[model samples]
Target: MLQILGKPTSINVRKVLWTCAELGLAFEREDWGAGFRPTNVPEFLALNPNAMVPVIRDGDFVLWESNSIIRYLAGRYGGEWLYPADARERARCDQWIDWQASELNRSWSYAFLALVRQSPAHRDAQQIEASRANWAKHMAIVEGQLQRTGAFIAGDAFSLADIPIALSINRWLETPIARDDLPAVDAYMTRLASRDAYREYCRNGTP
Candidate 1:
């Protein structure tokens, strides 16, 4: 059995958990963040120098980075429908997934911390407003893509790209911000919610 190290409430961890569920891969998960083993410990540090959650151990093989973990699980298991085999299709999936980790994810850190996380250190109204605007701007880009595809990201089929993108969108919707009416984005989220795995892992009624 595979071993996963992370808390279920973590969005990064949730991506991998949902991916494993999609691939029908069973894993033993240890709660290593928030309420369990602290990640800064030497043993955990040895597994991931970054000291981050969602590290995976597949027997002797080990991997970190949530998006990378999602890709690894999909490629290793029988999940070609999620990751795809065609070069172009895979590239498209990689593109959107990378975008979610980079651009879209960056856009929300400030406001999400201030609003959703309710961080005392992040309570700057002006800065929070700026971050909220930036986040919305990035989400508008997502809306456009969803409108173009008219289904899932990377085209009509649900691919690996949807995993992280859906998680990011969930965060955006949950965060308190001045969001514009993005009907397509709303509908795309609804479609993703229909999946049992997504509901259990990604949108499990937590943060």
Candidate 2:
């Protein structure tokens, strides 16, 4: 069985969990990070140099970073439905995944920390407002993509790209902020939530 190390509440970890659920791949998850197992210790450091949550140990092979892990799982486990086999189609999937990580995640972290997590260090009203504005701009880009595709992020068929984007959209919903009227994105969220794994893992009915 695959061994996954991370706390359940961590978004990145939940991404991996949801992927596994989609593929019907069974895994043993260890509670590392949060108030569970310590990641800063030497034992965990051997698995991930960055000491981040959501590391996976499969047999003798170990991998860190959430996106890479999900991609590997999808590819290795014959998840062609999610990852796709066509070169151009697959590239489109990868494109949106990268955008979610690089553009969207970067723009939303501060606002999420301040408003949702309520981190004392991130309690700056001006910075939070700027971050929220930045987040909305990035989400508008996603809304444009949804409108163009008219279904999933890559195209009509749901792909690996939607996993991270759906999770991000859920985070956006959970975060308390003034949201713009992006009808397409709202519809996309509804479509994604129709999947069982998304509701169980991504939404998880948790605050």
Candidate 3:
């Protein structure tokens, strides 16, 4: 059976889930992870050594890394936009995908965990402020890139670049750190909102 293990609340899991929905693919999923009793038993651990939420099972082929999963799905399911067929174009989008996994996610998480999850009494004000400051720097780079590239982060059309970044974008949209001025980012958010998959995936775990 095609299945995914993750809860809706996990930022990583939701990225994979949202991609599945975007590609119009459906699979069974286990609602697990995020402080709600993790069920990464040995059996499941075999599928993903990391035992992270958002691991997908496609027959004998098991896969982790939410970005990889989404790109794989798009390629397999004829999503030219999500998975550019052109080698050069695909690699270009892949660069942004890698960026999110490495730098963007880390910066955003600093903001999220510090501001949202922790109470004011318990929160690290320095960390929160520092992350927000760094995030602005990161976001400025993104905005400039978008303005130069036109619609979507990758190029002319939406692709893998949008998926990973958008995952974090959802988090930032609701966070207490007020940032209502990024026009390019805000425009991209609206563009994502227009997609039925994005909207539905936002509501519940998209499997």
Candidate 4:
């Protein structure tokens, strides 16, 4: 079986598991990193220099970096719906992926971590305030794009672009901060949540 070795607690791992569930590709997984912390050994390091969770071992082709892994899986097994075979449409999907990596993710991380992960004793007041402000603004950018595009992040059909943004949206919903009404974002998230893969993943919810 294809092995996805990562702790269940990781955001990256949740992303991978959701993809696998979406593809209906049966695979094995092992706990590593964070609370589990099994990545220090040299054997694991040989496979992933980053020593990060969500590393994939598909036959002899081992890979790391969570986003790349998602893209590879989409390309290899997720078919045209998740990763369109057409060049132009595929590139459009890639644009959202790139936005998540280069823009929205960094813009929102501080607020997310502060609001959801950090304890009051350890929190940085300035970071919490700045991140919330930043997240609100960047979220508007995405909402605006969705409005212009008609439906979906990239286009009409859902694609790999949904993976990162979907997870980030869920995390954002967990925050105490308020957001302006973005009906499209709300509707898109509803569509994303209604997927079968999303339901299967509910059996082992994110940690």
Judging by lDDT against the true structure, name the best candidate: 2
For model 3, how big is the CA root-mean-square deviation? 2.9
TM-score of each: 0.97, 0.97, 0.88, 0.89
Ranking by TM-score: 1, 2, 4, 3
Worst ten-residue run, lDDT, model 1?
A: 198-207
Worst 10 residues of 2 by lDDT: 198-207
For model 3, which pairs clash?
none
Number of clashes recorded per candidate: 0, 0, 0, 0
Write one digit per residue (lDDT tens) for candidate 2, span 110-193. Answer: 899988888999998999999999999999999999999889989998889999988888888888899998999988878877
lDDT of 4 at 193: 64
Residue 118 Cα positional deviation in candidate 2, in Å, after optimal superposition: 1.0
lDDT of 2: 0.90
| Model 3 spans > 4 angstroms off | 34-37, 119-122, 202-207
Off by over 4 Å in 2: none
Q: How close is candidate 3 to the true structure, as a TM-score?
A: 0.88
- Candidate 3 accuracy as lDDT: 0.77
Tens digits of per-residue lDDT for model 4 on 1-207?
799999766767877888887877788988887564678889899999888888999899998887898888877985567888889988888888888878877887766676676665537878888888898898888888788876788877777888777776766665667777888888887776668776555223442
